[PDB]
Amino acid sequence: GQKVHPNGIRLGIVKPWNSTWFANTKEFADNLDSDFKVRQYLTKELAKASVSRIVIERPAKSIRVTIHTARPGIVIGKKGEDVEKLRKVVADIAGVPAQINIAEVRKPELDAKLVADSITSQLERRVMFRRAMKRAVQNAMRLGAKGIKVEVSGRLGGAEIARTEWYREGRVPLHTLRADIDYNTSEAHTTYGVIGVKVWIFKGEI
RNA sequence: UGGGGUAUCGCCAAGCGGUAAGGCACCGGAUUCUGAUUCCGGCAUUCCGAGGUUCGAAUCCUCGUACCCCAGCCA
RNA sequence: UACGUCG
RNA sequence: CCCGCAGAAGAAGCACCGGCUAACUCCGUGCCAGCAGCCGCGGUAAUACGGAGGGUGCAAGCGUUAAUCGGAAUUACUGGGCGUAAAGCGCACGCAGGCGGUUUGUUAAGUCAGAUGUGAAAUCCCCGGGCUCAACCUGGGAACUGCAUCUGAUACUGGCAAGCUUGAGUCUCGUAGAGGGGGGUAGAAUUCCAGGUGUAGCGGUGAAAUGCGUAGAGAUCUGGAGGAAUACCGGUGGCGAAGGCGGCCCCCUGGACGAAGACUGACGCUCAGGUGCGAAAGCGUGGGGAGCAAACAGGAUUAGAUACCCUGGUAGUCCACGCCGUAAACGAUGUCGACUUGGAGGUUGUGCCCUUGAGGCGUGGCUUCCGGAGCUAACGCGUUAAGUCGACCGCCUGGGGAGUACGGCCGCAAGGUUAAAACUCAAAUGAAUUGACGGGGGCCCGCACAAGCGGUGGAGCAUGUGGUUUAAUUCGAUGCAACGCGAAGAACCUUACCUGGUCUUGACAUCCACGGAAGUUUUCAGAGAUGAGAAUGUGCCUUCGGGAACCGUGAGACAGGUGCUGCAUGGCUGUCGUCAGCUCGUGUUGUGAAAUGUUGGGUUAAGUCCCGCAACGAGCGCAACCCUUAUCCUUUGUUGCCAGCGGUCCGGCCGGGAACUCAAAGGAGACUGCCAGUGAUAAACUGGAGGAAGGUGGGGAUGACGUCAAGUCAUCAUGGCCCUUACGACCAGGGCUACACACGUGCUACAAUGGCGCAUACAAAGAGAAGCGACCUCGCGAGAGCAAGCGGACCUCAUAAAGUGCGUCGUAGUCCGGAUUGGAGUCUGCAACUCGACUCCAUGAAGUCGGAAUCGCUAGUAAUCGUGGAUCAGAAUGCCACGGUGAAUAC
């Protein structure tokens, strides 16, 4: 087990943080756990909506949750009853007056959360993994994407030993720190157990 | 049955009446991935059992035990 | 295990 | 056989389903039961076992077994092989056998053509015919591949007769040669013997010892004897059928090759049995015996050493005659002949040309190296074939058993030769590829070794582990990469363990139905929760049947599990290793596994970079981008700073100043950029200047493809299995702290480079509200009381300590060392007995520099000195950080 998380080593360099509140030591743990609850809830209740990121920020006793998603229409719905329902329950969880926004992730096959969730969904619909991976690399390289690597792992095809079998195309410069590597990871709970899907997407060199 | 010999650390084997020496083993450490080899340290038998002489017995004397050797013949 | 492919 | 009757009515199994081989899942079993033709399945999710569902193949059959042929070109006549897979006799001579150049004539035996007789019938085959069809029966033909006789043909083969020269042989003349046998001789050297000189070692080895030596060795000189071998020439040189043959000379003798010419005229090639020759060792008889040397003996080495090494040493090696009859007797390649591109040599002839020299042009014989086509599994062979053919011989038929046993023949014997079987395995083998490995080779690196400094192993204690104990001593981690590791902190809690007491839809969920707002202070029993009471209950809506929140009660569906499996998993981690590597696309090469690229010449920290190159490019990695540190500039200047000012309670203390330290943001800076030299004028290297810094400046982060079925199911998630009045839950007490022992990692020591007392100087980095907690008072002290200030460059923790200056101690188990133990306390916490931390008084072990062994470090490093933080109510000698002083050494 030996590679650094390629989001974490780029946190001040190119990648931003998904939480951008300041807090002293008295409420740092409380704000942090409140963020675990709103991302847990808001991740479970938008499983069909293809959600990429949820960014929390707290401007002066009020949360401001931004849902980067690929299907904004299914998040908002017929006149946005679903949004006001979500800020009602996020205001229930965080205990502050909640705002909520939706940012449309166009080009959803270049986002690693959406790619890993895609391949994970296909693996738990019992399709063969080489199609899922290989299709994901092809259609991601089709639109921009100066590199992509996907990597499934663990008891693939229902075996009794676990393999990995990664694929990559293009250039994925993972030790370069100015590389805009969009990396994310999902787990596929199949009837044989968990299958881990990692995906790195190299977008640009700065 | 008689004569001679032996009995001393777990094993083989030195001990001169005032102290128990050697090797193998065993115990601890080290070398080594681990074991053997190796290296460094240790321990250890109040001496077959009983009685006696002596200031003092593994040592000397007597008896018993256990095991060896030699003889047990001429008719 | 284990390699059998589409609008 | 035909017609009528009644009604789908009387009528489907067997094998197989992992691959071969058509046809798949579930359940049971868990290296068992069992299956199987071969490969092989079965040790918990088995398409292979047993059952079921489903399917597949055949069908009044279907499977198994036995037997034959096929596949099997694995006995090869069609139709195989033999350098290395099994297989070329050790080499020749040669009989019987097989084969035989060229021309003409005759024959016509083989060969061919036709005819005749026969080749029984049935059967097979073809065209028809009859049973409703088919099987079956049957008509006619074809066929029976043969044999015999007669008639012809005469190209090939054979017979016969005659020839001919291109095959084979004879003669003439020379050439080279370690060809053979017999005889003689010569020179160096070794050993021995006799003698001279001379004196303390010689010999031997990795080191030694045995051995020889003051009875005079070894060294050295002279004389002698004897035996064997023949330096230099000496050469992938020569000769020989092969084995083999090495001074020089003589005698007897075999073959080869060349030049011109003559002669014979197919006299040739191969060869089973047969015969001969046949290294070395060995055997017999008789000699010889210097060296060397099986056996043997001694010395060593070693765990042992019947060995390698040393010192001796007999058979043997040498000669004569006889035997044996074999070798990796090997070009692992039978003999003879023919044809098929080349190059460089060697050796031995011969012809021609100015031989104008150690030349030029040819033509033979033998031989070496490399290569073309071709062949070959590949490796390689390649006009001396393993190419393209012909003749004859020998041999092979999976590995082992076994070239063995029995029998025969041979042999003095040792043994040789010929040559099986039972049984057993599903491989054995060849060549080549990728890797790994090597006590193989070349180049290169790292505190790897070396050069040093300080440790560990010895002592006491701390902490972890193994073991032992226990009611339990919870579980996990175990070479490196487990062992102050998970645990950044076990009194209760944590806690998972043990002993008891208890609960069962539950401590934690969601959904019901009923009742009641919840909540708040009380008392009794017991270890807590269960029970008994008093107030408060309406927090807002409901054609009232209820809903918001919370608590009891009842059934459940469930909840719960730190239970098992890290060898079913994810995620996260260690490690080789921050080692420089790991690959891919397209192209090409190879039958192919694969190769190339990626290797080679340099260079680099680096598959770094240049150059070359059947490669051209690309990716992950290296480098850079990131953080920090080292210098300067700009901005802002509080709480931070004080150079110049003013006075000053002399303290940045105040007014004030924004220069400086500093703070933090933004820039500059270092890139082999410049110079000289060396280098493929290339990469680069070495040196120099400037500069705070010089060549990835220092440090960190960053850890490629993969390896260890490495670690974790106990952080979490998770497949399957398992418990679900219990393996779940609550509680109190205990344990995780036990202690004959052993190991790991640390701390403190053994002191004078120090101990103690007094004074005194210089830090950095941090933390802080249920917190850090000044000042002041009390206490010897740990601390206590009152209590400012500070959520913080402002206040507090908080005095840095080693250092320095004085005094003392004086080499003592001591004024070292502090363990251990008694007493007295402080704090935290419901609670310090098991089982805290600290203080005071007293006690004052072991220990005087640590055996074998072992570890860390290359410069602000090691060493040494303190300070802070996380976890935490309290508990660090650990961990993570911070600064002070500050080395040695690298050939």
PDB file of N, CA and C (backbone and C1' of nucleotides) in Angstrom, chain D residues 9 115 192 246 305 320 332 536 559 665 672 719 740 760 771-772 873:
ATOM      1  P     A D   9     -55.919 -42.369 -23.172  1.00  0.00           P
ATOM      2  O5'   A D   9     -56.286 -43.772 -22.510  1.00  0.00           O
ATOM      3  C5'   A D   9     -55.616 -44.986 -22.899  1.00  0.00           C
ATOM      4  C4'   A D   9     -56.575 -45.906 -23.612  1.00  0.00           C
ATOM      5  C3'   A D   9     -56.132 -47.361 -23.786  1.00  0.00           C
ATOM      6  O3'   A D   9     -56.322 -48.167 -22.623  1.00  0.00           O
ATOM      7  C1'   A D   9     -57.259 -46.563 -25.728  1.00  0.00           C
ATOM      8  P     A D 115      -7.186 -60.599 -75.693  1.00  0.00           P
ATOM      9  O5'   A D 115      -6.964 -62.135 -76.089  1.00  0.00           O
ATOM     10  C5'   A D 115      -7.271 -62.586 -77.427  1.00  0.00           C
ATOM     11  C4'   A D 115      -6.773 -63.984 -77.674  1.00  0.00           C
ATOM     12  C3'   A D 115      -7.266 -65.044 -76.710  1.00  0.00           C
ATOM     13  O3'   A D 115      -8.571 -65.491 -77.061  1.00  0.00           O
ATOM     14  C1'   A D 115      -4.950 -65.292 -76.996  1.00  0.00           C
ATOM     15  P     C D 192      68.702 -39.067  -3.801  1.00  0.00           P
ATOM     16  O5'   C D 192      69.629 -40.350  -3.989  1.00  0.00           O
ATOM     17  C5'   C D 192      69.188 -41.646  -3.588  1.00  0.00           C
ATOM     18  C4'   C D 192      70.073 -42.717  -4.166  1.00  0.00           C
ATOM     19  C3'   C D 192      71.508 -42.695  -3.732  1.00  0.00           C
ATOM     20  O3'   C D 192      71.691 -43.276  -2.445  1.00  0.00           O
ATOM     21  C1'   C D 192      71.456 -42.980  -6.068  1.00  0.00           C
ATOM     22  P     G D 246      56.679 -41.799 -30.693  1.00  0.00           P
ATOM     23  O5'   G D 246      57.799 -40.773 -31.209  1.00  0.00           O
ATOM     24  C5'   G D 246      57.451 -39.670 -32.035  1.00  0.00           C
ATOM     25  C4'   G D 246      58.571 -38.705 -32.252  1.00  0.00           C
ATOM     26  C3'   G D 246      59.305 -38.260 -31.000  1.00  0.00           C
ATOM     27  O3'   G D 246      60.635 -37.832 -31.335  1.00  0.00           O
ATOM     28  C1'   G D 246      58.213 -36.416 -31.915  1.00  0.00           C
ATOM     29  P     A D 305      38.299 -37.813  11.278  1.00  0.00           P
ATOM     30  O5'   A D 305      38.384 -37.783   9.700  1.00  0.00           O
ATOM     31  C5'   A D 305      37.987 -38.928   8.958  1.00  0.00           C
ATOM     32  C4'   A D 305      38.186 -38.666   7.499  1.00  0.00           C
ATOM     33  C3'   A D 305      39.444 -37.888   7.105  1.00  0.00           C
ATOM     34  O3'   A D 305      39.895 -38.435   5.842  1.00  0.00           O
ATOM     35  C1'   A D 305      37.625 -36.971   6.051  1.00  0.00           C
ATOM     36  P     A D 320      60.012 -54.628 -26.741  1.00  0.00           P
ATOM     37  O5'   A D 320      60.294 -56.149 -26.400  1.00  0.00           O
ATOM     38  C5'   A D 320      61.505 -56.790 -26.827  1.00  0.00           C
ATOM     39  C4'   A D 320      61.437 -58.269 -26.540  1.00  0.00           C
ATOM     40  C3'   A D 320      60.137 -58.951 -26.936  1.00  0.00           C
ATOM     41  O3'   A D 320      60.061 -59.302 -28.302  1.00  0.00           O
ATOM     42  C1'   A D 320      60.690 -59.583 -24.749  1.00  0.00           C
ATOM     43  P     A D 332      32.021 -34.320 -32.644  1.00  0.00           P
ATOM     44  O5'   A D 332      31.249 -35.494 -33.382  1.00  0.00           O
ATOM     45  C5'   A D 332      30.078 -36.034 -32.825  1.00  0.00           C
ATOM     46  C4'   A D 332      30.355 -37.427 -32.500  1.00  0.00           C
ATOM     47  C3'   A D 332      29.382 -38.408 -33.104  1.00  0.00           C
ATOM     48  O3'   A D 332      29.970 -39.686 -33.299  1.00  0.00           O
ATOM     49  C1'   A D 332      29.151 -38.275 -30.716  1.00  0.00           C
ATOM     50  P     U D 536     -49.783  20.859  40.784  1.00  0.00           P
ATOM     51  O5'   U D 536     -48.838  21.292  39.579  1.00  0.00           O
ATOM     52  C5'   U D 536     -47.798  22.276  39.747  1.00  0.00           C
ATOM     53  C4'   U D 536     -46.644  21.953  38.833  1.00  0.00           C
ATOM     54  C3'   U D 536     -47.018  21.640  37.391  1.00  0.00           C
ATOM     55  O3'   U D 536     -47.214  22.818  36.608  1.00  0.00           O
ATOM     56  C1'   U D 536     -45.518  19.995  38.202  1.00  0.00           C
ATOM     57  P     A D 559     -32.023  -6.080  11.203  1.00  0.00           P
ATOM     58  O5'   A D 559     -31.550  -5.683  12.681  1.00  0.00           O
ATOM     59  C5'   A D 559     -31.894  -4.365  13.101  1.00  0.00           C
ATOM     60  C4'   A D 559     -31.757  -4.166  14.587  1.00  0.00           C
ATOM     61  C3'   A D 559     -30.370  -4.321  15.173  1.00  0.00           C
ATOM     62  O3'   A D 559     -29.527  -3.216  14.868  1.00  0.00           O
ATOM     63  C1'   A D 559     -31.938  -5.314  16.614  1.00  0.00           C
ATOM     64  P     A D 665       1.300  34.734   5.132  1.00  0.00           P
ATOM     65  O5'   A D 665       0.861  35.871   4.111  1.00  0.00           O
ATOM     66  C5'   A D 665       1.238  35.718   2.714  1.00  0.00           C
ATOM     67  C4'   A D 665       1.218  37.052   2.024  1.00  0.00           C
ATOM     68  C3'   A D 665       1.946  37.152   0.696  1.00  0.00           C
ATOM     69  O3'   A D 665       1.279  36.521  -0.385  1.00  0.00           O
ATOM     70  C1'   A D 665       2.469  39.028   1.973  1.00  0.00           C
ATOM     71  P     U D 672      21.455  23.386 -14.724  1.00  0.00           P
ATOM     72  O5'   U D 672      22.543  23.542 -15.875  1.00  0.00           O
ATOM     73  C5'   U D 672      23.935  23.416 -15.600  1.00  0.00           C
ATOM     74  C4'   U D 672      24.619  24.707 -15.921  1.00  0.00           C
ATOM     75  C3'   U D 672      25.243  24.763 -17.314  1.00  0.00           C
ATOM     76  O3'   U D 672      25.294  26.107 -17.785  1.00  0.00           O
ATOM     77  C1'   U D 672      26.935  24.950 -15.680  1.00  0.00           C
ATOM     78  P     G D 719     -22.291  -8.195   2.909  1.00  0.00           P
ATOM     79  O5'   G D 719     -21.871  -9.528   2.187  1.00  0.00           O
ATOM     80  C5'   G D 719     -21.661  -9.555   0.772  1.00  0.00           C
ATOM     81  C4'   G D 719     -21.030 -10.868   0.349  1.00  0.00           C
ATOM     82  C3'   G D 719     -21.500 -12.119   1.041  1.00  0.00           C
ATOM     83  O3'   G D 719     -22.735 -12.592   0.517  1.00  0.00           O
ATOM     84  C1'   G D 719     -19.167 -12.149   0.931  1.00  0.00           C
ATOM     85  P     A D 740       9.020 -15.227  41.798  1.00  0.00           P
ATOM     86  O5'   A D 740      10.329 -15.979  41.311  1.00  0.00           O
ATOM     87  C5'   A D 740      10.218 -16.845  40.180  1.00  0.00           C
ATOM     88  C4'   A D 740      11.323 -17.862  40.173  1.00  0.00           C
ATOM     89  C3'   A D 740      12.462 -17.609  39.193  1.00  0.00           C
ATOM     90  O3'   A D 740      13.434 -16.719  39.758  1.00  0.00           O
ATOM     91  C1'   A D 740      11.690 -19.850  39.009  1.00  0.00           C
ATOM     92  P     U D 760      22.477  36.597  40.903  1.00  0.00           P
ATOM     93  O5'   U D 760      23.180  36.479  39.472  1.00  0.00           O
ATOM     94  C5'   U D 760      24.150  37.441  38.997  1.00  0.00           C
ATOM     95  C4'   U D 760      24.857  36.920  37.762  1.00  0.00           C
ATOM     96  C3'   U D 760      23.946  36.483  36.635  1.00  0.00           C
ATOM     97  O3'   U D 760      23.425  37.533  35.848  1.00  0.00           O
ATOM     98  C1'   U D 760      25.542  34.793  36.981  1.00  0.00           C
ATOM     99  P     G D 771     -10.986  23.827  33.821  1.00  0.00           P
ATOM    100  O5'   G D 771      -9.571  23.460  33.193  1.00  0.00           O
ATOM    101  C5'   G D 771      -9.402  22.882  31.880  1.00  0.00           C
ATOM    102  C4'   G D 771      -8.489  23.744  31.029  1.00  0.00           C
ATOM    103  C3'   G D 771      -7.322  24.448  31.715  1.00  0.00           C
ATOM    104  O3'   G D 771      -6.211  23.584  31.904  1.00  0.00           O
ATOM    105  C1'   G D 771      -8.364  25.927  30.199  1.00  0.00           C
ATOM    106  P     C D 772      -5.158  23.865  33.048  1.00  0.00           P
ATOM    107  O5'   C D 772      -4.328  25.104  32.503  1.00  0.00           O
ATOM    108  C5'   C D 772      -3.405  24.963  31.405  1.00  0.00           C
ATOM    109  C4'   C D 772      -2.678  26.253  31.152  1.00  0.00           C
ATOM    110  C3'   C D 772      -2.037  26.887  32.373  1.00  0.00           C
ATOM    111  O3'   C D 772      -0.785  26.313  32.740  1.00  0.00           O
ATOM    112  C1'   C D 772      -3.166  28.537  31.150  1.00  0.00           C
ATOM    113  P     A D 873      -9.450  13.861  30.611  1.00  0.00           P
ATOM    114  O5'   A D 873      -8.666  14.828  31.591  1.00  0.00           O
ATOM    115  C5'   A D 873      -9.324  15.979  32.151  1.00  0.00           C
ATOM    116  C4'   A D 873      -9.074  16.009  33.649  1.00  0.00           C
ATOM    117  C3'   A D 873      -7.672  15.606  34.116  1.00  0.00           C
ATOM    118  O3'   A D 873      -6.780  16.722  34.045  1.00  0.00           O
ATOM    119  C1'   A D 873      -9.303  14.528  35.458  1.00  0.00           C
TER     120        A D 873
END
